[model samples]
Target: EVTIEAVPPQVAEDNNVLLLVHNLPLALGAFAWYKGNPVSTNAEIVHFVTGTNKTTTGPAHSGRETVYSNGSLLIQRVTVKDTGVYTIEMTDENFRRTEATVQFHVHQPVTQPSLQVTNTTVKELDSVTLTCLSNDIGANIQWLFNSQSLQLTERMTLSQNNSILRIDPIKREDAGEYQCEISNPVSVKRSNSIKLDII
Candidate 1:
């Protein structure tokens, strides 16, 4: 069995921070190396984050070429799209090679959701409303206060409209920002800067 590990996951944020930071390495290696042909079927594996497969047998294997590999690849830093299928080739003495594909899944860590409290005045018994927003590509909304989960309410409520969470009627006790959590099937993202100040 062949295995590959990604150190830090990849991301595509506003400024393309990942593009500027991570330089994921691709390594390919054959189980056995021979004089006539260096690589074997199943003996070698090539890894790529993005772009189609291309071999260096001239421009034919252009994109499918490997930067480094010898049975293991030590990628420095990896990105999200690099999270996909990889192929391994096993070559025989006759130059006949059998290929196998391996899959790698790189997950983006979900950050805590940011809470924004619309500027409003609050009274002792007045209803308070808290709303939450998520910036992830595809995320579900969840709201929590002091570690306890919040359920949707009709009046003094917690409501989710897609990525937004709304809680109503400004109250003196509800002046602080609550925790907002956003999640998708693949990853979870959070924001700590979300805060609400009531006067």
Candidate 2:
């Protein structure tokens, strides 16, 4: 019988953490299981190093492979891909084997973002639009006026894309410097100062 536990003796990383184990053979291969299911997620396999570059037995898995010690598990920058339970299997010199499992979780961060207003002049609120864009994961869009989420009127609204933000009906209220901010669960991004002037 084999016993499994977390690395750092008793410490666990938040969200994504570094994991190591003991009591396995040098040539033994290791992998993880998610929710009782074989970890098929591409990135999560980074924690489990196998002998073969591409898998031929068990589930179809792929990632960087390494085997030099007693079954080591290295998860670099763990993400949501490292969730659920993980099992470790090993083979010894005598051909005897043992295995164990532990749980892994990836933490997502809150994005703190800001925005910008493109262009400056529009025809008396005819349909003035401002935009804010950013490169963030799962980032969302929002307009802020004086540090508050801008309230939209029939003549005003907002538009967005994976990296673009636009506002309609540029008014005196929309005149002053406005903010366009983007955010995701991992992080946030802001634009340079945006200045708008309505004639």
Candidate 3:
């Protein structure tokens, strides 16, 4: 089956990545890589001719596009602008045709997160809410205790995105260092630790 594969699936901005074309026919001939719908050559990034060894750079080319002998495409230092669908059209020696498409997404590196708590010292049977703040929305959020992944207990609850944690009736075992982490495909960041104790 002719198909397009994103090497890492989730690419990080400023990273070099491959848009691999797989299961190509053995007698591969010419192929063209295009961005978006590619209604015309205007959307073509590159077209290569194996026999002539001639490579034509298209209007869509940003000096970052390269075509592989196997009909794959490579983008050097890909950025958010390169995030979109890419199409590949190829032919066998006998002129048999095949086409495939794949979507590309580039995520920016995450910045350091800010972790806030309602109170570091609380009495037993008291409640505390932890919040992880990030300006970069849609990134994954994680909580940590004692510099390790947090363990949820019956008295603890988290918000939908795991950015908020509420521990009702705080316990002695919960006393330790707490931190928050944020990440995306390209980068990860953790906030400074804060000590928590039960009085």
Which candidate order results from sorting by TM-score in descending order?
3, 2, 1
State the local distance difference test value for candidate 3. 0.85
Q: What number of backbone clashes does candidate 3 have, counting pairs of residues 3 or more apart or in separate chains?
A: 0
Compose the digit string of candidate 3's lDDT tens values, residues 68-162.
87888889898888888888888779887777888878988888888888888899889999989888888899889998998888998889688
Give the deviation of candidate 2 from the true structure as CA RMSD: 8.9
How many steric overlaps does candidate 2 have?
12
Q: Which candidate's TM-score is highest?
A: 3
- TM-score of model 3 (CA atoms): 0.84
Off by over 4 Å in 3: 1-4, 37-42
Per-candidate clashes come to 37, 12, 0
Residue 117, candidate 3: how far off, in angstroms? 2.4
lDDT of 2 by residue, 12-79 (tens): 22422334565554454544422233433432333344555433223323332332344455444444
Error of 3 at 6 (Å): 2.8
lDDT of 1: 0.43
Error of 1 at 118 (Å): 5.2
